[model samples]
Target chain A: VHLTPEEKSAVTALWGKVNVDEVGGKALGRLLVVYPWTQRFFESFGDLSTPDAVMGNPKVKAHGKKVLGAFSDGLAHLDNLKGTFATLSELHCDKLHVDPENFRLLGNVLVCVLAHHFGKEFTPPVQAAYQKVVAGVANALAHKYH
Target chain B: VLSPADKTNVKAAWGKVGAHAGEYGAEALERMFLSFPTTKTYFPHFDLSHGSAQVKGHGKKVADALTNAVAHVDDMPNALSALSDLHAHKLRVDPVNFKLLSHCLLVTLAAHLPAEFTPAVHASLDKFLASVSTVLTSKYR
Candidate 1:
């Protein structure tokens, strides 16, 4: 529900590391490439109704599965980008260039957005746990960077 | 400018942005890059040579548009309809990219707005972005 003080700190740290100009360019470019993938996922998700509709109909189920897979893959791509920021820091690249703090914050936000949009399959506690992890990560990033 | 579908999408997107305005700063440029990397190709059109001044100006414009749009999210259908027609007939913007823009916008907001990315805000943003994505997909079909 609410973010803890620690979580808030995490978000602040991530924001601090971002080089808005450079990161903004990369983030925008990625959005253009990934939008189609997300669109396809949503289209397929909208088509399925009951569990039977997804399971009894092989084509429909397959379509649903494909969308889920694509969505997950998209999230993974975002995670990889986060990893790049971490690596950039390890290499001692200018923090301004990598903005690991923002990466962590964005990563948490992305997962929360995904879960918020498509978490019917996930149990409520599981969803809450996911949010907590994201918050925790934000805090960690903040403590390290800020 | 927006197509009929894009108009719908924009309104929906604006709803989330409005609901979350207090939680985040205007980081639309960063977000646009994340969702639609190809769009970054257009950054050269923005003339960053002016330095932070140019970015600040564009950011302020985008932020203002988002803020204004969100404020009217509840009664946006008429305006959106007009925008949709413009996008559909005149703007010539790709329908797919509209969804991408929404995605970028939401993600950017989440990333930049510390202490503000609440569950409520996330839900609102998701709903808004989903609405936009749906309209864009319909237009492409």
Candidate 2:
């Protein structure tokens, strides 16, 4: 994905809040992006009779829109927050499983995959700029977790 | 992708039929009764055949939920918490009974899925079952 300077800065700032040591910050951000999208993907094309049938499903399109809407809300929430550790605390208390420590590493890995597949939207010249970010996030997540 | 051999093994492992309907059938209830006889008193209103059916249904629901978890391993926390909430609320089955049920499931799987019961699968399932058992048993007292 092609992230504009403003969006990149916004995401980076959000990352700085949850990761106390700045560990796995970018990876966590990518995870934040992927989950809702994956949920959206399942909600839409999951029960398709055939793989090719998914492309024609109206429900998939509708769910994608919902996903995008939820993504916007999540991004706004992250931006409004102060720092990475605070965000991590919220996630631990709310969205994450009861044992947040057991899950922190797994969450980072999942986020990196999501970022790799669905990075920022950009024009032709800036194609795959998010790929490096994706790689960086993956490396960071792997080093910290696995 | 799961290799053809692994796929065949998985299918074979899941294919065994128990003496009763399945994990939720008479055998499970019988096992539970053996583990905690007094627990059966709670369901006194249930007829033998009907009660067996109910228990079987509950077992199937748990199995289905487990299947769903495997399908969404990425979002396991949400799945597990959803189960924890369900057990905490509507399900009146005792925490010890959960362990008993798991024991029964393992026995059932071992009997039925013998072909797929490798050391790795056995150890992994043992750990998973023990972890949940610990959580449930801890909550009761």
Candidate 3:
């Protein structure tokens, strides 16, 4: 899928207002907390057994920022998601063998985080645009499987 | 995009489809993906295996969108504006794929709802799907 110019404008406009670092960690934090099964992948992260622990852990926050940075890179490469995420896709899909469902779940959690922070600004149209962005990112990251 | 008779025909046909919309939609999608593998490229993240819940869920969404269009025959453009934008701008799906799916859906309905898929009803549903496809692909430039 390709982002239409207007949809790109909507995404770009809303993205301009995001606090990338803060939202990044919050999204990743929510993903692990809301979907407990995902914690199995992060046994080394330590103490993700509790929601409070997952939220308070510096490791999560730091890793979240990194994950969000990846998203930021995706935003920059809307026209070429498969190309942009080639390495990451290989690592997750080919090498590590992460389930693609988790990618969709995290993408959804990021949207929830955006909704929580930007209630009024995250209108249906903009939310729809954001969803397209995330779906593209997820598809790109999963492409290596095939 | 549909005439009064066409709208009436579509509504009556959809009414017959009632609770089985998702099944029909999934079958249509399965037909399309199996018949035309190129369409599968759009859904790299989807688990396109036989009887995948993901495919079923996506089919349900497609059925729901069509159902919504059926309900708002007079205001389809506005009612489906969000989806139209998503398909045209974000997904950048090729217009030809819509025709491919539409063909699969027709075959699916013909197989399952034999009596209801009469020539007139088939024409009406075809027109309705074509209209929706036009709206979805209208923004392509």
Which candidate number would show the highest TM-score if scored against the true structure?
Answer: 3
Model 2 chain A scores worst on lDDT over the 10 consecutive residues at A32-41
Candidate 2 local lDDT, A1-146, one digit each (tens): 33677656655554434323222323333332332212221332454433334434555545434433333333444333223234444543344212233234334453444445445533322333334343333232233222
lDDT of 3 by residue, B1-141 (tens): 587988999999998988999987887787677646789999999998878999999999998899999999888888889998899989999998997687566656665675676545665777788888988887733
Error of 3 at A67 (Å): 0.9
Question: How do all the candidates rank in terms of lDDT, highest first?
Answer: 3, 2, 1
DockQ of 3: 0.02
- What does candidate 2's lDDT look like per residue over B27-97, in tens digits? 55556666655456546775545446666775566566555544444444455665654453224334445
lDDT, residue B26, model 2: 50
lDDT of 1 by residue, A1-146 (tens): 24456544543444344443333322222221223232233243443343233224444334434323332333234334234234434432344333444444444344434433332332223333344444344443343354
Candidate 2 docks with a DockQ of 0.04
**Reference-based lDDT, residue A7, model 2:** 55
Candidate 1 segments exceeding 4 Å error = A1-146, B1-26, B41-44, B48-52, B81-86, B132-141
Candidate 1 chain A: worst-modelled 10 consecutive residues by lDDT: A25-34
